[PDB]
Amino acid sequence: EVKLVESGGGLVQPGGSLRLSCVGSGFTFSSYEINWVRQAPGKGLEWLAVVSKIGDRTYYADSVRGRLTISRDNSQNTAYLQMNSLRTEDTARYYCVRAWCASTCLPGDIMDLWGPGVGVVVSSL
Amino acid sequence: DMVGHHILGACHSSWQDAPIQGTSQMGAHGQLQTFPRNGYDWDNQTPLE
């Protein structure tokens, strides 16, 4: 029943911008935090970004600080990720994950339900 | 008059094992003693951030 399906990703040239939109259904999206996590095809997971419950208090990762800007709209139950600049390293499957507080509160400790994943394939060709 | 004198011996409970986190064990007088997980209430199935 509960889902975090997302879309808005595709093949883009390097040094470009992308708009990833993640929608949620049937789990009161305004009350739970949502994070964005990167998984490289062979280099394991990597946590990218956090937006809090209200929409403010955004804290990113060290490797993508400033490069990625996250946003949240609780009216239509959406979380947006802006990839303002993209190198060739950023080709990966991006997941929007629901994560509430167990020990570490705002970065999230229990990533309960993961989105199906959207594949960003940056390429100069 | 008469008085009964007794010396009760030493009393000490047996050594037990500290429970693993998340384990809820049946206890005394019909009470389910819970050592719940992080982020949950005293009831192990109720979230508590």
TrEMBL record, chain B:
Domain of life, per lineage: Viruses
Subcellular location per the Swiss-Prot or TrEMBL entry: Virion
The protein, known as: B646L
Gene that produces this protein: p72
Residues of the full protein shown: 103 to 151 of 646
